[PDB]
A paper describes a structure:
Desulfonation of isethionate by the bacterial glycyl radical enzyme (GRE) isethionate sulfite-lyase (IslA) generates sulfite, a substrate for respiration that in turn produces the disease-associated metabolite hydrogen sulfide. As is the case for the core architecture of all characterized GRE eliminases (Backman et al., 2017), IslA is dimeric with each monomer having a buried active site located centrally within a barrel comprised of two five-stranded half β barrels, anti-parallel to each other (β1–10), and surrounded by α helices. Gly805 and Cys468 are 5.2 Å from each other, competent for radical transfer from Gly805 to Cys468, and for the generation of a transient thiyl radical that initiates catalysis on the substrate.
The lengths of these channels range between 14 and 19 Å from the active site to the protein surface. Residues along the channels are highly conserved in each of these four GREs, consistent with these channels playing a functional role.
Residue numbers in the entry: 6 to 830
The structure:
Amino acid sequence: EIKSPHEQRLEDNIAGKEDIYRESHKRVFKLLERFDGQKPAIDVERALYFTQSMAETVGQPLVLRWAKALMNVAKNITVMVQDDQLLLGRCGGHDGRYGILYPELDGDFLDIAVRDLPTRPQSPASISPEDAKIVVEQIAPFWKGRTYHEALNKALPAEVHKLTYDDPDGLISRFIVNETSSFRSSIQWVHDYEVVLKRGFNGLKQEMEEKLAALDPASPVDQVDKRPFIEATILVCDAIVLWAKRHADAARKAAEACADPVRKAELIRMAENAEHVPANPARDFYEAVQSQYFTQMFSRLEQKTGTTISNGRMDQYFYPFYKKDMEAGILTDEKTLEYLECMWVGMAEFIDMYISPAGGAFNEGYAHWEAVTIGGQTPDGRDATNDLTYLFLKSKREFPLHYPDLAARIHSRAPERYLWDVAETIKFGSGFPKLCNDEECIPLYVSKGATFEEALDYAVSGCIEIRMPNRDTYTSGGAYTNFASAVEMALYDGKMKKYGDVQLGIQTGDARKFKSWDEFWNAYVQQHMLLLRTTFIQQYIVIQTRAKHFAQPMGSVLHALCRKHCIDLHQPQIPEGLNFGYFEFMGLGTVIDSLAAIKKLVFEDKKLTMDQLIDALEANFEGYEDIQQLLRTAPCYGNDDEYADEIGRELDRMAVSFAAKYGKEMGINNDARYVPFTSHVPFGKVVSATPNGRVAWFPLADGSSPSHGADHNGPTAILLSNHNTKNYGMRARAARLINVKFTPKCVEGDAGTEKLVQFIRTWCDLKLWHIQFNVINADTLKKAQKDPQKYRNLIVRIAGYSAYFVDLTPDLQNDLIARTGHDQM
């Protein structure tokens, strides 16, 4: 057993050695050492001043109410300068790690959060007694009966509601057909940050002022629909500029108070940055970073974007500034890294807080996906690797936090040097970068109306989604659907052991009496299709309800189509826009292996009856351990085994075929996707023992990865099984998340790096959308479990993101531990 660089850095931590890269990243190491190990605090300032303005503007158009509320935040929120920081911009008054509150989304959870957040098993957070008082006395009262979650809970018909929530108020999910619009303002998103760098918000404001002056004063559409949108974007331009200007004043005040002449000069430079950007076009690399940073941070104040607002193709839109400053002799590669890593530290201090229980369970370990995209192709079809591409990879290797959410684009002509550096970065052993395959998503997107130019220029967004920031217009959170519960409902006449005698699914009969595979298969299909009908019905209601509760004036002004047609992003239909939505197929590996065990062992080979099987399941395999071992011999997904994989291909076909038929009457693509967040942990907690040998309440298979320990034929067979369970003749599909784990010995040395490169090129050829890797020894995870304080800095890749292992619940830790660690390729 050899150790990954990450495991060696952990050993150095335990010994007390200074990190080997600390001396070349000294400023940002001093920065991150100040908030290491602290539980984040809830900050109420954004929520307070947002609510105070919204309470005064009831009746006015929502997009204009939003811009007025953001101006009230900009004028009143605490502004500060952090010691040794080179960047300005923060979303609260708290030092260290902090999250903020969005009462417009889930304000009906504020009393629960005030009591239960500091001790929650997933991602806890503290709140001071004074801030708790402000929450329950000044923020929560106005939002009673006005939150999006309250409106969604009341809008769902009873038959849908019973598969969505366990209680009449919607405070507890059943994790069957799980709505996700209630614990984030929208799905993932990427702003067009380059238009800010090239024109500033003054340029955008001027463009919108020209549209205001061109309105027909007699046109009711111009005056009632377009004017409040236009006035909202103009006001939000002023709001972010004022907010930046307040940061400039704070830096000047800190400069005068500081006797150190060097730090005094830095503070003045920072004050001058904030006085120029994001109002005006950036003039160098330092201004470009500060301008982008102001925009993404102010975005957090605007709304709780799913996975936290993503950052786009930073190695492309920052490159002209980097190249000019390098050639002029005013920038170095080390100073470039220092600017970027100050941005990472600031993003690491902002925690995207989910205050509801389902929100917390979906986002273990303070989960975040502020996707930063590098590599790929230019809008005119050339490779886009540049010097910045390699600096981002270098930063992720040496900067010790699991920030940023680095995502590398792969295409069939990606340079050898680029793929080699990507493979070596993966071998550092913290999960970075995740890979997105141009060859899979670009033909899907041009088929669905995108031009090649805008498809080639896509940014990674969130987990592994893609965005065209001036063409994408769909923002509604999708359903997460538990198809493992369909297996259980097919066994127990549409009931689930977790919920006892609640009639959840179709009454498909006593599975003990089933006499053929055709009979049990027909029973599963009826529950499978019920989950699909429920999924799309739920989504249609979500789309209509979100349009009455959310607005995004700054994000809209950064969108060319919203500027052209003068309509806010969260409306269901924007002219010329393309709408890419999703529903989640959760538990694919669990469903395939369960159905294959029944088909093979019960009906084909007749090694046991339905009665013996269900006896073992209801006993949770207690007293039936020989049966549990037998069930684990059936064909399983992730082994290139056609017996299992054709079942999974039919499962996928049903979902995609349904998506193809019923998306269009909702006016969107609502495509089948296999990206789990950490929802496979609570989805597993509600599913009892399954015919694949999985014990009750154990996590489901993650993403489209094989079930834990079911992949016995090497890592490449995982890729082949993924291909074999897809339907490339149809298009109503989106990403699949693949988690693969190697040991460090498996990819040791340059020979191991070359093996990983070829693994990636095979993955690319197969048109698989996503892949990411853990490179870790099994003993590291077990030692971290036994002594969490000694291994508190252990970072592992979970689901599109990495987190500290000790921050994960035991269930999610068991998921990571039970994933097969491949010792050879």
